Amino acid sequence: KKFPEGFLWGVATASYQIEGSPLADGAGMSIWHTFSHTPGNVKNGDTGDVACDHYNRWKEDIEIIEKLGVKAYRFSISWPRILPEGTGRVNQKGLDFYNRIIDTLLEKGITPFVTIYHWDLPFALQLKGGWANREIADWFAEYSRVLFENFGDRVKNWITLNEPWVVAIVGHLYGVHAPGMRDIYVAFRAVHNLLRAHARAVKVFRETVKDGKIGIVFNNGYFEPASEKEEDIRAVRFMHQFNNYPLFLNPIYRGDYPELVLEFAREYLPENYKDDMSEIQEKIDFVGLNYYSGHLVKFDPDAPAKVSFVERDLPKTAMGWEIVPEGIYWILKKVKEEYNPPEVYITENGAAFDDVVSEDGRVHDQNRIDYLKAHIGQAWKAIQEGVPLKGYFVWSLLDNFEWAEGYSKRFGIVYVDYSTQKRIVKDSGYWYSNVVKNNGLED
Numbered sequence: 001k002k003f004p005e006g007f008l009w010g011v012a013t014a015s016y017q018i019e020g021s022p023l024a025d026g027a028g029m030s031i032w033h034t035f036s037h038t039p040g041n042v043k044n045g046d047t048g049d050v051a052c053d054h055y056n057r058w059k060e061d062i063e064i065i066e067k068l069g070v071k072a073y074r075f076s077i078s079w080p081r082i083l084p085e086g087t088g089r090v091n092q093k094g095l096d097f098y099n100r101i102i103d104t105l106l107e108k109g110i111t112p113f114v115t116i117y118h119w120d121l122p123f124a125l126q127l128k129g130g131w132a133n134r135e136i137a138d139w140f141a142e143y144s145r146v147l148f149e150n151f152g153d154r155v156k157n158w159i160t161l162n163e164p165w166v167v168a169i170v171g172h173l174y175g176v177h178a179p180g181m182r183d184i185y186v187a188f189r190a191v192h193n194l195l196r197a198h199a200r201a202v203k204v205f206r207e208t209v210k211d212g213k214i215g216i217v218f219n220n221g222y223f224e225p226a227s228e229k230e231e232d233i234r235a236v237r238f239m240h241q242f243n244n245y246p247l248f249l250n251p252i253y254r255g256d257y258p259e260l261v262l263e264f265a266r267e268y269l270p271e272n273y274k275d276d277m278s279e280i281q282e283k284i285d286f287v288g289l290n291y292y293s294g295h296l297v298k299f300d301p302d303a304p305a306k307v308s309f310v311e312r313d314l315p316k317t318a319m320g321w322e323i324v325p326e327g328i329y330w331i332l333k334k335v336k337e338e339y340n341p342p343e344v345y346i347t348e349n350g351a352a353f354d355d356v357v358s359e360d361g362r363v364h365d366q367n368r369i370d371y372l373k374a375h376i377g378q379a380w381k382a383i384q385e386g387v388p389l390k391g392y393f394v395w396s397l398l399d400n401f402e403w404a405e406g407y408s409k410r411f412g413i414v415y416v417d418y419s420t421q422k423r424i425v426k427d428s429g430y431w432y433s434n435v436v437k438n439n440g441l442e443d
């Protein structure tokens with residue numbers, strides 16, 4: 001199964017998950033700093049204080065990417081390293097950190113994909129309401145503009161937001177991610193502001209980087225119905241419209257939220273939200289889709305949104321996520337069918353397994369090889385049926401801080417021994433390196 005000429009094989013990380021040294025060199029606090037330093041928020045009190053120490057070990061890590069012959073690296077920039085107070089003052093040492101990474105990658109022929117926002121909002125902006133405040137569209141545009149002015153001569157591939165559904169709903173409704181709120185009205189104003197801020201950033205990108213491309217990344221699940229009942233099929237319709245790309249792409253491409261999202265959430269959205277839609281339709285260059293698992297879904301009259309998940313005894317990862325490789329083909333087809341974006345990337349796909357270093361000094365993660373191979377094959381399929389998939393990114397290069405799970409979930413194709421900071425390329429890493437070299441699968 002060979003991929004198109006020029007297909008980008010990548011690996012992906014995020015600033016707070018790997019860097020450590022959150023307050024180094026004049027950096028401002030982030031909301032993940034204050035959230036993880038609040039007892040009870042993160043499994044066994046884990047924080048991003050040290051993480052993978054990538055803040056110091058960045059050169060070695062890139063050298064690993066090079067040695068694996070991986071062609072593209074998706075990483076994110078810590079907003080508070082660049083603007084410690086969120087707006088105003090620019091921190092040169094913050095710029096220098098990412099300049100060195102950028103220059104290094106280009107020297108080695110690796111393509112940088114920069115995620116502008118992967119969840120580490122400056123604490124100083126959270127004090128002014130964060131994603132709840134309409135003014136964040138201005139704050140975000142200013143931050144984006146600084147990035148473009150400083151890095152846009154070298155970085156040509158940009159992503160505004162990582163998984164804005166998670167940012168809004170997990171952060172502001174479920175309260176399990178920073179800033180840790182549980183208010184459905186705040187959560188939907190966050191959804192809306194994330195859109196407005198994304199669109200402002202695209203608009204300034206067009207004034208600042210006349211040769212680049214910019215897009216946005218969404219999380220997606222593969223939802224199937226529990227039965228053939230009408231109501232279960234509809235529960236699936238709502239879950240795709242709410243949890244997957246349509247919550248955002250329907251505004252971007254059609255100028256309104258999806259119909260089942262409005263049925264559920266119109267009372268929570270700002271009163272004149274439609275006034276912002278023509279601006280939200282700012283043209284984007286690509287869609288990034290993240291994908292991990294599938295979910296059986298059932299109408300449920302008692303559930304908060306009239307939907308419950310139902311367990312299936314399929315193979316699961318350490319996260320307890322059902323392994324459903326056909327979901328990545330489905331989401332790929334669906335996105336072309338619904339919005340026909342000109343380019344698509346799988347910006348994250350991967351798995352967490354309970355990896356051990358064997359006596360042989362190796363990490364035999366056949367379970368992860370099997371997971372990757374299966375999904376890469378289904379992505380291959382989608383390409384054969386005309387989906388303009390331009391790239392595929394494994395989450396993650398490294399084992400890292402898995403948010404509220406802390407270090408207990410390992411997604412890397414490279415093992416990190418946190419006691420020593422030693423990297424050990426896993427079997428899956430060697431395997432993936434062979435698929436990049438061959439531009440696809442042997443089977």
Ligand SMILES: OC[C@H]1ONC[C@@H](O)[C@@H]1O
Binds near residue numbers: 014163290348395
């Ligand atoms: O849960 C796995 C990944 O999902 N997408 C966002 C990442 O930061 C996260 O680690």
